[PDB]
Scaffold this motif. Structure first.
Motif, PDB file in Angstrom:
ATOM      1  N   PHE A  29      44.231   8.779 -21.805  1.00 21.34           N
ATOM      2  CA  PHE A  29      43.488   8.003 -21.858  1.00 21.34           C
ATOM      3  C   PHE A  29      42.368   7.989 -20.542  1.00 21.34           C
ATOM      4  O   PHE A  29      43.103   6.990 -19.788  1.00 21.34           O
ATOM      5  CB  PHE A  29      42.630   6.904 -22.866  1.00 21.34           C
ATOM      6  N   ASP A  30      40.878   8.166 -20.693  1.00 24.30           N
ATOM      7  CA  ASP A  30      40.005   8.276 -19.739  1.00 24.30           C
ATOM      8  C   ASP A  30      38.664   7.372 -20.015  1.00 24.30           C
ATOM      9  O   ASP A  30      38.094   7.863 -20.918  1.00 24.30           O
ATOM     10  CB  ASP A  30      40.326   9.596 -19.011  1.00 24.30           C
ATOM     11  N   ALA A  71      51.573   2.607 -21.983  1.00 24.57           N
ATOM     12  CA  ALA A  71      52.917   2.308 -20.638  1.00 24.57           C
ATOM     13  C   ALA A  71      52.130   2.334 -19.772  1.00 24.57           C
ATOM     14  O   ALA A  71      52.489   0.711 -19.036  1.00 24.57           O
ATOM     15  CB  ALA A  71      53.716   3.024 -21.404  1.00 24.57           C
ATOM     16  N   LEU A  72      51.641   2.810 -19.163  1.00 22.81           N
ATOM     17  CA  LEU A  72      50.696   3.367 -17.783  1.00 22.81           C
ATOM     18  C   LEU A  72      49.638   3.111 -17.228  1.00 22.81           C
ATOM     19  O   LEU A  72      48.760   3.996 -18.401  1.00 22.81           O
ATOM     20  CB  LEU A  72      51.023   4.192 -17.130  1.00 22.81           C
ATOM     21  N   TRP A  73      48.547   2.938 -17.121  1.00 25.17           N
ATOM     22  CA  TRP A  73      47.597   2.812 -16.569  1.00 25.17           C
ATOM     23  C   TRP A  73      47.266   2.898 -14.818  1.00 25.17           C
ATOM     24  O   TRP A  73      48.512   2.560 -14.164  1.00 25.17           O
ATOM     25  CB  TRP A  73      46.985   1.514 -16.481  1.00 25.17           C
ATOM     26  N   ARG A 205      36.905   2.299 -14.155  1.00 28.92           N
ATOM     27  CA  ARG A 205      37.359   3.335 -15.030  1.00 28.92           C
ATOM     28  C   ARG A 205      38.631   3.542 -14.723  1.00 28.92           C
ATOM     29  O   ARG A 205      40.017   3.509 -13.584  1.00 28.92           O
ATOM     30  CB  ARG A 205      36.521   4.525 -14.454  1.00 28.92           C
ATOM     31  N   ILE A 206      39.346   3.319 -16.011  1.00 25.53           N
ATOM     32  CA  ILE A 206      41.247   3.487 -15.485  1.00 25.53           C
ATOM     33  C   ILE A 206      41.297   4.562 -17.091  1.00 25.53           C
ATOM     34  O   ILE A 206      40.646   5.109 -17.332  1.00 25.53           O
ATOM     35  CB  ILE A 206      41.390   2.195 -15.861  1.00 25.53           C
ATOM     36  N   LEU A 208      44.837   5.767 -18.705  1.00 26.44           N
ATOM     37  CA  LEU A 208      45.855   5.026 -19.721  1.00 26.44           C
ATOM     38  C   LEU A 208      46.875   6.103 -19.950  1.00 26.44           C
ATOM     39  O   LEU A 208      46.305   7.160 -20.268  1.00 26.44           O
ATOM     40  CB  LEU A 208      45.983   4.387 -20.924  1.00 26.44           C
ATOM     41  N   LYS A 209      48.236   6.334 -20.469  1.00 24.56           N
ATOM     42  CA  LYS A 209      49.337   7.019 -20.318  1.00 24.56           C
ATOM     43  C   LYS A 209      50.459   6.621 -20.864  1.00 24.56           C
ATOM     44  O   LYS A 209      50.750   5.364 -20.156  1.00 24.56           O
ATOM     45  CB  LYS A 209      49.536   7.369 -18.843  1.00 24.56           C
ATOM     46  N   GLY A 210      51.393   7.223 -22.037  1.00 25.34           N
ATOM     47  CA  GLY A 210      52.691   6.788 -21.997  1.00 25.34           C
ATOM     48  C   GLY A 210      52.468   5.818 -23.535  1.00 25.34           C
ATOM     49  O   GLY A 210      51.559   4.979 -23.691  1.00 25.34           O
ATOM     50  N   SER A 211      53.216   6.900 -24.529  1.00 25.55           N
ATOM     51  CA  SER A 211      53.246   6.214 -25.576  1.00 25.55           C
ATOM     52  C   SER A 211      54.171   5.378 -25.836  1.00 25.55           C
ATOM     53  O   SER A 211      54.535   5.369 -25.442  1.00 25.55           O
ATOM     54  CB  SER A 211      52.646   7.225 -26.924  1.00 25.55           C
TER      55      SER A 211
END
Ligand SMILES: [Ca+2]
Ligand SMILES: [Ca+2]
Ligand SMILES: [Ca+2]
Ligand SMILES: [Ca+2]
Ligand SMILES: [Ca+2]
Lengths: 218, 189, 218, 63, 189, 189
Positions: A29-30, A71-73, A205-206, A208-211
Motif C-alpha cells: 500500500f502506498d 508488517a513493513l513500512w 507519504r509512506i 506499507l508492505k507485508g500482510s
C-alpha cells in the motif's frame, strides 16, 4: 434418467492466499502525498526545552490503524510545515531539524540546532504562505517555513512497524535500528508564560508492505 | 550462489490436547547441506525460501495444517486460524493433501496444482546481507535486536486439537541463497 | 486461490506390455544375412571320423546371447563355406552335407556321404574364390565350395530355443523335434598326423520370436 | 450434517433443533462432507453453483 | 605427440602340441624407442595402436595366425577360434601371408590390400590420460584394478597345434601416442 | 564453482635427514574452508591448484626450497635436487625470498617477480570428476588404486640438510574447484 455416483474417500482443499491481497486487504500500500496534524509549537520557560517527534506511522491518526494491518513500512516523504497563528508583535523564532542517529544528542542552543539535517528557522509569525502547501502536492515557496527529511537514505530499507514506544533502558543503538529519525523543534526565546504561536503540519507519504494480523502486530 | 537446494526441515508434529505451533527461524544454520556450506561464509541473503508440505498419513485423518511467515520478530505468533489467515503467504490444507508437490523437490517450477507450499517473498531482502548465526536467540534478547539478523519466522499450526499425538506429514524446504565473505567455519558463530 | 481435493479409496494401475517389445527388447527379430566362424576342418587318422555340427543359434557366438532373450526361432538361411588355407601339394578332399533326420546315421564313406542333402566336395586346397562370399550377400560362384541347408522346409515351423545339448539317453526321434538338422564334414583321406587344411564359415539368417526371461530360457 | 442460517432480530432465540433451524433466514444444510465445489467460490465473485453449501444475508434490508 | 613410430613387438611363436596364445599389454613400456621417450613423462594416451604381422616362413607352412583386442582386463582370453573371432579388430591369415603390409611400417596409410593388421579403436580413450607404468601386474592384483591403467590387451593365437615349434612371423607395432606431465625417468614406475 | 580460495597448507619444515620431504595429497579434505564446503558434494574437479611459498626468516638463512607435483601415485618421491627438478611444475628458490608472492593471496593474477609458486596443470582433469574422499589412504592400499581418486601429490623438500629443525616459511594454497552431486556431509566418506 440415471446419474452415476462415485464419492471420494474424503474431501478437502488447498488454500494459498496471495493474489496481492490477504484476508481482503492488499499486501502492498502506498498512501501517496497526505497531510495531517503533527502538533503545536509549544513555548516554555526552560532554554534546554525542545519538542521531539519520532518519525513513525503512529504519528498519523487515521493512517495509523490502517498501517497496523501491515508488517513493513518505508518513508517516501516526511516534511513538516510550520503555520503561524499569532500577532506580528510576537518575539522569538522557531528552529526545526532532523536527527538521523538515535544516539546523537538533542541540540540545546541555536548554534547547535543549526547543524541538524534539513534545518530551518524563522520568526514565529513568519511562514504564512505555507498554508497553501496543505492538502496539495505543491512544492515549498513563498516565505513557507518547512523542513523535509531526505528520504533517499531509506529507499532500500524496510522498517518493521513497531507500535510500542522506546523504553529508557533501551540502548540508543538498538532504538536506532527501527526509528528512521527524530524531528526536533526548539524555541530560541524562553517565555514567561507558556504559549503556542503556531502549528506543525505533516506532509508525508509512506509505503506499507507485508500482510499480518493487526492484533499480533507489535 | 548455491542454487536451489532441498532440505528436510522437520516433521509436522501434532501433540494431543493442544493445537500445534512450530516456529522455524529462517536461517541455513540447521540445514544438513546448506548449513555446512554456509559455515564457510560470513554473510548470506535469501533469494528463494519456500516450504512445501508432503503428507504421510491416511485419507481418513482429520484436520488441516496451516503455514505462514512472520516478518517482524516482535510480532506475536498466531494462536487461532483467523489470525493465522492474515499472515504472509498463508496456506492451509487437509493434513493428507499436498502429494502433488513431490516434483517441486528436484525441480525449480513454481508451486502449482494441489501442491501445499508457502514461499517467503524475498524481494524484501534483495539489498541486504545478513550475518550467518549459529546460536539460538537468548530468551532475554530484545525482539527488536533479534529481528536485525533474522529475515523472518516460518510458522506451522494445526487447526484443531487431536486426541492422540501423530506426525501427519513432512516439511520440506526449497531454498536458494547467496553466500559472501570468507571466515573459518570454526570461528563462525 | 482454493483447489478441491477428492482422493480415491485406493490408487493403482494396469500394465500390459506389448507394443511389439517387452522389457525394452523387441518381441521379433531378424538377423539378416550374417557371417560367423563355424569351425576348422580337422583331419585325423580314422576313416570313420567325421565332424558334426548341430544347426542351432548356439553356434553363433555373439548372436547366441541375443537369442537367449527369445523363445522361438527359425532358420531362414544356413550355408557353410569352406575356405582353404594350405599348400596346393596337400592331398585329399573334403565332403560336406546335411542330415535332415536325427535318426539317420552319419555317413562313413564317400559313396554314402555323396547322398546327403546339399552335398558338396572338393580337393582340400580348392574353393579359394569362396573368400569373397564372406560378409557379403553375394551368391556362390567361382570355385567356391559351399553347402546350403534348404530352409524352405522350415518356413512354417517355429523351433523352441534350447540351450542344453542332447543327451545320449535321448531318443533320436525326440531330439529330432527340436533340431532342424545336422551338418556333417568328412575327410576322404586319412592322415598320419592330424592337421587343419581349411576353415568352415557360416553364412546364416534366423528369425527370433517371443519374449522370455533369458535366465528362464532353457 | 451442518445447518446454517441468520437471525434478524437479536431478541429471537437461537434454534435448538433441525425443525426450528430450518426456518431461519437463508437457511441451508448439507452432509458434513458435502459442498466441495464451494472452494472455487473463494477469492472470486462467482455465484454459488455445484454442490456449494452457502448462506447469504439478504442485505437489501440495510440499503 | 610422438607421431607414428614403428616398434618390434616380438616374434610369433608356435609351441608344439599346444595352440599358442601370446598376450601383450597395450603400453609403451617395453618399446625400444617409445619406451625410452615415454619414461620422461607421467601420462600417456594412445592415438593409434595397430599391429601388423609380417611373415618369414615358407608358403608350405601350415596354419594361420589370429589377432584381436580385449577391452576389459577381467574378460578371459579366447581359447578357440570361434571365440577369438568375436574379439575387437579380429584378423586372421595364413601364417605365410601379410607380406604386403611391409610398406605400412614407414608410412601412415591405412591398412589395405593383403596386409594382415589389427588396430585398436582409440576413440575410446580420446578423453582419458593413463599413468605410465613400468611394472608387470601382480598375480594377486584384482583385474578391475589393472583395468584402470591398462587401455587394452592384444592377443595373438595359433589356429591349430604344430608338431615342431617355430616362429612363422614377426609382430610389428605402428603407434602414435600423446605424452604429458613431467617426471624423472628414474622415479617413473 | 568455489572461485579462488586461499588455504593454509602448512609450514615448510626443515629437518636433519636428507631424504626428508613433505608430501601433500591434492584434495579439499584438510582445507579449512574448502574442506567444509566440499563435504556437501559428492564429486569435484580441480580447476586451479597452486601453492605459493612465503618466507618468515632472516636473510642470513642458507638453503633453498624445491616444490613440484607427482601425477602418478606409483611414481616414487624425489630424493635429490637433480630428480626433483623433473617433477611437474617444478620451482625452487632461496629460503628467505619470495615476497612478491604475498599479493597472490587475495589477487588472482599470475606469479611474477621473485614469487615462488607451483601450479598444478589442471587441463589434465578437465574431462573428469573425482569422488571426494575424507579418509587417509590405507598403508596396505595398492598405489594404483589410490591413484584413481588422488589427482596428484605435491612435494616439498629442502636441498640443505639442517643441524637444527626449523620452519623458514609457510606453504599457501590458492585453489578453485568445481563441486557436483549432492550428498549428506555425514554420509560423505
Ligand atoms: Ca510489527
Ligand atoms: Ca557469523
Ligand atoms: Ca527355451
Ligand atoms: Ca608412472
Ligand atoms: Ca565421498
Amino acid at each position: 434418467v440415471s446419474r452415476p455416483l462415485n464419492p471420494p474417500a474424503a474431501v478437502g482443499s488447498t488454500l494459498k492466499a496471495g493474489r496481492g491481497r490477504t484476508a481482503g486487504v492488499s499486501d502492498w500500500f502506498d498512501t501517496g502525498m497526505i497531510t495531517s496534524y503533527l502538533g503545536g509549537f509549544q513555548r516554555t520557560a526552560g532554554t534546554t526545552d525542545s519538542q521531539v517527534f519520532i518519525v513513525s506511522p503512529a504519528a498519523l491518526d487515521r493512517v495509523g490503524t490502517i498501517a497496523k494491518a501491515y508488517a513493513l513500512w518505508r518513508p517516501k516523504h516526511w516534511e513538516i510545515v510550520y503555520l503561524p497563528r499569532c500577532s506580528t508583535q510576537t518575539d522569538g523564532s522557531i528552529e526545526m531539524g532532523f536527527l538521523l542517529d538515535y544516539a546523537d544528542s538533542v541540540p540545546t542552543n541555536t548554534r547547535t540546532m543549526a547543524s541538524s539535517t534539513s534545518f530551518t528557522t524563522s520568526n514565529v509569525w513568519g511562514g504564512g504562505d505555507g498554508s497553501s502547501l496543505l492538502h496539495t502536492s505543491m512544492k515549498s515557496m513563498g516565505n513557507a517555513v518547512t523542513s523535509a527529511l531526505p528520504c533517499d537514505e531509506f529507499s532500500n530499507k524496510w522498517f518493521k512497524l513497531s507500535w510500542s514506544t522506546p523504553e529508557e533502558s533501551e540502548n540508543a543503538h538498538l532504538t536506532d535500528t527501527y526509528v528512521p529519525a527524530r524531528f526536533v523543534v526548539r524555541s530560541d526565546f524562553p517565555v514567561v508564560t507558556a504559549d503556542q504561536p503556531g502549528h506543525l503540519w505533516l506532509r508525508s507519504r509512506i509505503l506499507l508492505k507485508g500482510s499480518v494480523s493487526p492484533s499480533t502486530n507489535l
